[model samples]
Target: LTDPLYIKKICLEKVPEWNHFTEDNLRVKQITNQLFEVGLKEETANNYNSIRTRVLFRIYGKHVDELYNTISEFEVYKTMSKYKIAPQLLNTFNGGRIEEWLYGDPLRIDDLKNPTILIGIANVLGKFHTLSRKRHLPEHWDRTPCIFKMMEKWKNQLFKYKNIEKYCDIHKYIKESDKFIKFMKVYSKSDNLANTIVFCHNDLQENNIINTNCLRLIDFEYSGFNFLATDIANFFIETSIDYSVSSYPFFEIDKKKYISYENRKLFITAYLSNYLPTPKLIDEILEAVEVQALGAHLLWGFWSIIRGYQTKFDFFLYAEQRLKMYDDQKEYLISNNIIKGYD
Candidate 1:
C-alpha cells in the first residue's frame, strides 16, 4: 500500500538482491507498486515482482469473497496438465490472501474465431471441467460465494438514488427482466436433469482468458464449484450479444456484431463434440446449455446490483438484454415442452 520501502521488503523476502527500479520504470506505476498489484493477494503481487524474469503479475480488486475464491482456482491450474489445457506450473502457493501469478499472452474473442485457437479454448475448458470433477474443496472454496446471493445483499444499492421514483421509472425494464428470470428458472428446472458439478471459471470473458501457442485461463478470483452449464452459459453470454434489445442502455451494435447466438451454438457444439463424444453425453451437454443460460442471467443480474452504479451500469444493461433474449427464446422452449411454467 506504501512505497519503495515496502516494495524492497517484499522483493527481499521473496527473492533477494533484486533491485531494478529506475526512472524508466518507477517502483510504483499507476497505483501499482513496482513490487505489488493492488487489491487481493497483495503478497503474491510482490512475489511476482521479485521473480520478474520467469513470471509476470497483474492484480485485480473485487469483493473480499473473490479474494478467497482464487484459492480453489490455484488447485485447478496445478492440475491442468491432466486436461492438457495449460502450461506446466513452476510453483504455486497461497494463504487465502496471495494467489499464484498466471503467465501467458492475453486472448481476444476475435483470435478465438481462428479454428485452432477456438478448438484449443474449448478443449481447455472441457478438460478443465473433467479433471476438476473430483478435487477436494480448497481452503477458501466456499468463502467467495455466489452472484445470486450477492444480488440479494445489494438490492437496496441498485435503487439508492435521491429520486427513487425517477430511478425506478428508468429501471422498469429491469423489473420486467425479473419476471423473465422467474419464468426461465421454472422452465429450465422441469426435466429433473442433474447437471455435472465441477470447478469453474465463473468469469470467462475474452479479456480474462490468455493464450500463446496454448490457451491459459487467468482471473480465477471468481472461480468455484458450480453447475457445469453455468460455466458454458457464462462464456456464451459474455462472448455473444443479444440483438433483441435495440434501444436498451449500454447497447452497442458494433460489439454485438462480432458474436451471435448462432456463433455461440457453434462454439458449444465444437467444444462438446470434442469432450463429450457419446450420445448420452451430448444430451447432457444440451441440458447443460439450458441450465447455464438461466443460471447465468440470474447470477449476473445479482452481480450487477451488488457492483452498484459506480461500476455496474454496463452489467445492468447487459443483464437486461440477456433477460429479453431469455423471454424471446421462451416460446420455442415451451412449444418443445423442454420446460414447464412449474416443474
Candidate 2:
C-alpha cells in the first residue's frame, strides 16, 4: 500500500540533487488523497548507496478547506526549517506540493512524561511561537473569526442533514453545543487573561511532531495566529495515541493522556526557559492552558462532526470523544475553580 505509481514517477523525476531511483526500491504511501509519504530505499540507489529522498505531499486541503483562499505560510515553515524544528520545504505545484520527509519517529503517548523530553518539546514550541510573532500574517489572519465561522457552518450542516444525526452525532452535538461553545469562548476569548496572539500550528497532534536527527514539526495546513495557551493545551489533549470507534456513532479514546501536574510545571518552564519567567506568570499560564485545553476539545469536537460528514475517517467517533474530553476538562476545571462555572 506504500507504493503509488504517480507519486513514484514524480519523486523519481523532481527531487533536486536527486540520485537515480526507480520503483524497484522506491515506495510511496498515500496517507490520504491529500497527503502522501514518498520514501526511497537503499536498494533503489547506486551500489552501496542506501539513500532516498525523504519527502511528504499535501495533495489537497482539509474538509471545507477547498472553499477558502489561503496563502502559504512559507516563512513560518522556513523559520522552523532553519531551526530544524520542521522539515524543509522543497518544491510546490498547483493543487499539491512536496517537502522534506522527516527521518524520525513520533513521540509515544508516555514520552511526554519524561521531564527532559517535556522540556525539549516545550522549548521547541516556544521557539516556534516566538519566531512566528515576527512574521506578517495573510489578510483576515486572526483565527478567532475563522473558528466561529466554522462552528456556524457546521451548525448549518447539522441542520441541513437532519436525518443523519445518529450517523454524524449531530443531535447529541447540537444538544450540547450551546454550552460547549460558551465553555470554549470562556477560555479562547478570556477577558480575565492578557492573551498574546501569535502563529499557532492549530493542529498540534502526534504525526505533526517527529523525531528525526532531532524533533521537527510538519503539516502547516492549519497554521495561523491564535492564543499561545491554545497551542499548549491542544497538544495535551488532541495528541491521544489510542483512538477507536466504541459504538455505531460514538468514538472512544481508550487511553488519552496529559503530562503530570508536576511535569506540566516543567513543560511551561522549559517553554519559557529562555525568557525570565516569574512565579505569577507561570501560575497564570498554567491556569489559562488548563481552561484552553477545554477549548481545544470543543473546537476539535465540532470539527469532528464536520469531518464525519465530509471525510472518510471515523470522525463521528472522534467528535464524540472530543466532546467527552471537553466535558471532562470542563468538570475538572470548575471543580478546581479554574473558571468558576464560566458565567
Candidate 3:
C-alpha cells in the first residue's frame, strides 16, 4: 500500500472529507482482495452519499482482463445513470476509480417475487438493450455472447481441480453444455434470434441491483454487447443459485433456488411489456427467452468454475448449484413447456 501510485488511488484521492488521516479518522474495509471500501469508519458509513470513498480495483489475467482492456469510453454508465437505469459512477480512471455510496444496498435474492421490483428491473434493462450501436463498442457488438470466454476461463483453471473432473461436475458441464451450445448456435441462425441481439449485462446477480429511488444497476466490469437471451438468462440464473446460506469449505449438495413456470412467465411478460405493454405478447421473443433462460445455466455453471478462484465469495458453490439446476430446469421445461415454437 506504500507505492506512490497506490498511495494516490488507494488513499490520497478518496474522501475529500478528510484532509489528513490516521487509524482514528480514516479506515479501510476489505470487500475483497481486489475490492475495498475506504471511507469513514463503519459507524458513519450508513449516513450515505456524504460518505466519499468508492470501491476500486483492477482485474488481471486473460478472457475477462482482455474484455476490460477493450473497454471504450464509459459514456454508457454516465448516460445510463442519467436515464435512471443505473446509479451514478464517479471519479473513474483508466484502470480504477471511485463510485457513489448508495443509501440502499443491493437487492435481496428473494425479492424477485415482488412484481413491482421485478418489473422495474426488467424495464431498465429493456431500455439499455434497445439502443443502437455507438462508437464506444464494436460495430458487431450485438452478435457477441459473453460466454464465448467460457472455455478460455475454464482451461486456465482446469488444473486447479486436476484429476477430479467428475468431483467438480466438470464432466457434466463439458458434455451437457456442448449440447446446449450446439442448440444455441443453431438457434442463433434463425431470423428471430438474429434480430434479437443487443447490449447485455453479462452478469446480473443481486449485488449489482439497488432499489433506492428506483432500481439501479451497478458494476459494469462484465457488461458487454451479447445475445439478449444470454443477458436475461444470466438474470434468471441469479435466482437459481442460493448464495446467502452455504456450508463453508467443501459443501454438501446445497439446494439451489428456482421459480415456478408461472414465475418465469411473469418476469418475461413484464420484461417484454416494458418495451411495449402489449395486450397479447411477442411470441418470437418469448420463445427465444424461454429457451435462452436455460442457456445461462450452461454459461455460468461452467464459467464459474474458474471464477470461483477470482472471488473470496461462494461463487464456486453457486456455480456447482447452477450446473445441477441445468438438468432440473431442463426437465421442467420439457415436461411443462409454456412457450410455443420450442423446437
Candidate 4:
C-alpha cells in the first residue's frame, strides 16, 4: 500500500493553503494513478466534509484551470443554498498544474432506492437548471456537433471479422439499431423547442453525485448547455444500464418501449412541477422531450456501435432493449401528434 503520510506530506508542500491537516479533514485514497484523494483543511460547520479540500487530478487536459474558472462563473453554490441543497464550492487551484477534487461521497445509481435520496437529487437538478438558464456560456456549448464528430472519428474503429461466419440470433439487434439511426435522421431537423437548452449536468449518474449529510453534485467536466430531454435520456440510459442487473430484460423491445416512455413521463412531470409553474410551458416541455429523445437515440447508438460490437453480448442486448423502447414510444408520439415521426 502507498503511504498515506507521504501523500499528505506531498499535498501539504504542494497546496499548503488548502491543507491544514485536521482530524476530520484528512483523507488519502488512491482512486487511480491519475487520481488521488488528498486531505485538507475544513471550511464549513456542516456535518458533510466541508472546510476540507479534496480533488480529482489531471482533468480536462491543459484547460483544467479554464474549466474551473468556467464552473466558478455559475451561481451553482448559491442556487443549491436557495433550495436547501448541500452543494458547496470549495477553493479551486490551477497555477502551473491542474487538479479537480471535491469533499463528498460518490453516490451510485444502486444507492438511490430511498425516496429522500431521489427527491433530493430532483431538487438539486431543478435548481441547477433554473439557475443555469440565466447564464451565458462559452461558445463551445452546443454538444450536438461534438457527438457527430465523435461518431465520425470512431467510424473506422469497428472490429473486423476474419471471415463471413454464421451469426447468432442476438447479433440481429445490431442491425436493428443501425436501421433506427437511419429513421431518426429524417425528423432530426424538424424537432425544436424552447427551454430545451440549459446548462445540463451531462453526467448525472449516481457515481457523480455525492451525499455527505446532504446531496451534492460533482464532476462538472462534461457540463454544458444541451437539450433537456437529451439530458434526461442520458440519465435514464446510464441509470438503466448501471442497474440492469435488477432491471434485466431492459433491452427487450416491448420492455424498452414501456420503461422509456413511463420514465420520461415521470421525469417530466416531476421536473415541471418544480421548474415550470405556468401551464403554457407544457407545450414547450413536450417539444423539448421529443427533440431530446431523438438526440439521445443518436448519441447512444453511436456509442454502442463503437464499443458494442466487441463486447457483443451484454451491451448489444442492452442496446436492443433500449431501441425497442424508443420504437414503442415513437408510435405513441405519432398517434398523439406529439411528434411528426421518429427521427
Candidate 5:
C-alpha cells in the first residue's frame, strides 16, 4: 500500500488542492532506489498557489536492517527542525514521512571559498553542538553515542569477511582498531573543553549541506553525542574528498582541497566565537581537533570496509583511502608530539 500510487493517494487525500487531481496528474520521480520526488504535474502546479509544489519522499522498506534506528533518527529530525537547522517534517506514514523540499542546491566544494558561507557553516555547527544538555534529551530518544558504537560495530562486521583480499593489509586495521578505541576512551577522559561531548552532525560532508539562505544541513542518520573535536576533524577530513564524481569509485580525493592551517584556525575560531575564549585556549582546542582527525579517518575506514561491494561507490578503494589517511594523520600526530603511537 506504500507504493508510489498509494503515496500519491495519501498526498492527494491530505492536501485540499491536490484533492481535485487524479493519480495520473501526480508525478513521482525516483530520486534514488527508495526515494521519490512527489508533486503535481506542471499544468496542475500552475493552477494552484498553495505555497509548496513538491515534497521529498524517502522510504525504508520493511524488515530492512539499518545501522541506526529510524525511530531515533525521526526524533533527531524533529529536534533539529525545532532549531530551524533541518528541513521541516510534514507528515509520517508506516514506511516513511514527507519532508519539505528546500529551494537550494547541495553545497559544493567551492562554495566554502566564500568567507560568508564558511562562517555561516561554522555558526550552524556551533549552534548544533549546543542542542543537548549533556546528551540528555526528550527522554524517549536513544542516548547512545552513535559514532563510537558505529566504529566498533562496523569494525567487527568487516572481520566477518577476513578472507577477502584488498589493497591494504586487513590485519593492520584489525590490529589498530583497539588502539583507536582506547585512545578515544583516554582522550575523552581528560577534563578539557575540547573533550566536551555534544550532539554532532557526525557526517558533515559538502553534499550533506544544503545551500539555503543560511546554509542548512540534512541527513541526520549519523547525528548523535560525540566529542566536539571529533566532529570538527571529521568535517575537515571530508573537505578533502568530493563525493560527486561519476567515475568508478564515484568519489575523488584531492589533497589540495584539504583545509589549510589558516582556514582551519579561522573555522575553529568562528566555531568557538560565541564561547568567547582566549587565544591560548583556542590554539589548545585546535591541537586537540587536529589530532582527532585520525579518529575520523579510522571511523570511516572501518565503515567503508564493512560496506565492501555493497554499492557501486567502490567501498574497498574508499576504505583504502581512509586507512591511508589514518596512517598519514597518525604520523603527523606522533611527529608533532600531539600523541604517541599505540605500540
Candidate 6:
C-alpha cells in the first residue's frame, strides 16, 4: 500500500474527475533524494505538459516508525488543518493519507536569518502554543506532554542500540544522560516551567516550514503538548544545523552558527507580545531556553541512537554530533554558574 502506484490509485479515486485520469496521466514523484531513503510522494495530473492538480501522500511507516504516535499525529494534523495552520487533509488510505498540495518551497536554514521570516515563525509558534487554552481539547485524545513521555521512555533503554560503542562511548552517554535528567528535574521545578505547558511543534526544523504567501508548518509527527520553552529551545538549536548535506553524516551542525543573542530576543519578544505583554516575561523565558537547550540536544541524540539501525540517514554520526554538542553546551552553562555538577 505504501508503493507509489498504489498511492497513485488512491489519489485517482479522490480526484474530482476520477474517470478522466489514467495511470499514465498522473505523474507520481517520491519526495526523497532517491539515493539513500524513500519518502512522501507527490502526484500530479499532467495535462498539456503541465500540472493540473497535485496532492501529497505521507506513508505512515516510512519516516516515523517507533519514535512517534501515529494516531496522535493524525489528530494533531486534523486540528491544525482545520484551523488553516497547515495543509488541508484530503483523504486517508491503509498505509498513508493524502493532503492538498501546498504551492510553495520548503524553507531552508538560511531563511531563518531574515527578520521577517523569524518574526513570522515566532508569531505562528505563539499561536500554536495557545491551542489548548484557546480551543477545546479533542475528545479521547492523549493530553500527556509528548516530550516528557518520550524522554522518560527513552531513558530506560540504555543498552538498546547496537554498534553504539563504535560511534559514542556508551558509558559517557549514560552518565551524561543521567545528569541531564537530574538537572532538568531540578531546573524545571525551580523555574516553575512545569506549569508553562502548551501544545508544541516538537520538531521545528527548517524543512518542516513551508514558505507560501505566509509560513506554514507541516509534519505533525512530533507535535504534541510540552513545555513552551522546550519547543522554543528545540527550534533555536535547529537553527544551527543544515540537514541537507550530501555526505556520510548527511547533516551539519556548527556551534558558531547558533542563533545570536539579539535574534533570540527579537524572536522571544515577537512570540510573547502575541499572548503575554510583560517586560519580565521575555527575560524569564529567554533564560529558561538555555537550560532546555541541553534537553533539546540530548533528546535528539538519544533518538538517533534508537533509530540508527532503521534509517539510512547515518544516525550514528548524527548522534555523535548531538552528544558532543550536549557536552559542550553543558560546560558553557556550568562555567556561567547557571547549573552545578550533579551530586
The candidate that wins on lDDT is 5
**In candidate 3, what are the lDDT values of residues 19-51, reduced to their tens digit?**
454435445554522455556656544554554
**What overall lDDT goes with each candidate model?**
0.49, 0.64, 0.59, 0.48, 0.75, 0.73
Q: What would you estimate as the lDDT of candidate 4? A: 0.48
Candidate 3: regions farther than 4 A off: 2-9, 14-25, 40-95, 133-143, 149-161, 164-169, 193-195, 246-257, 276-284, 308-317, 333-343
Residues 1-343, candidate 6: write the lDDT tens digits.
6465766677777654444566665656666212111222244322333433666666666646456666777877888888877778877766677777777888888988887889999988877777778888675776666656777666555366555677647677667767777776666666543248787878887888888878888877778777788888888998889988987667888777788888988998888766454557666787788888887777888887777755657887888888888888888888888777553
Query: Model 5 reaches what TM-score against the true structure?
Result: 0.89
CA lDDT of 148 in candidate 1? 41
TM-score for predicted model 6 compared with the true structure: 0.87
Clashing pairs in 1: 27-34
Candidate 5, residues 131-248, lDDT tens digits: the string is 7763346776555566578777767666567565644677777677678778777777787788887778888877888886567789877788777887788888877898888878
After superposition, which runs of candidate 2 have C-alpha atoms over 4 Å from their true positions?
1-3, 18-26, 29-35, 39-44, 47-52, 61-85, 135-140, 143-160, 168-194, 239-241, 244-256, 340-343
- Please give, for residues 87-141, the per-residue lDDT of candidate 2 as tens digits: 6667776566677766778876556666777777888788777754455444554
Q: Which window of 10 residues has the lowest lDDT sum in candidate 6?
A: 32-41
Q: Judged by TM-score, which candidate is best?
A: 5
lDDT of 4 by residue, 38-125 (tens): 6443442244444334644332233333213335424443344344432343333342222445456777655554445656666667
How far in Å is the alpha carbon of 226 misplaced in model 6? Answer: 0.4
Which is better, 1 or 5, measured by TM-score? 5
Q: How many Å off is the CA of 255 in candidate 5? A: 1.8
Instruction: Give the root-mean-square deviation of each candidate in angstroms.
Output: 7.3, 4.3, 5.3, 7.7, 2.8, 3.8
lDDT of 1 by residue, 1-343 (tens): 2354544334334432234432223233332012243222344446555444322222334453432334444565555434444444433222222233455567654664565666677777876666454454445445322434333434435555455332233365345345544654454344423255566777776666786556777655466666566677666565554323445353442335344545555566667654455556556666557645654654555455444444532555554554455455455556677656522
Error of 3 at 153 (Å): 5.1
Query: Model 6: how far is 298 from its true place, Å?
Result: 1.0
* Deviation in Å, model 5, residue 40 alpha carbon: 1.9
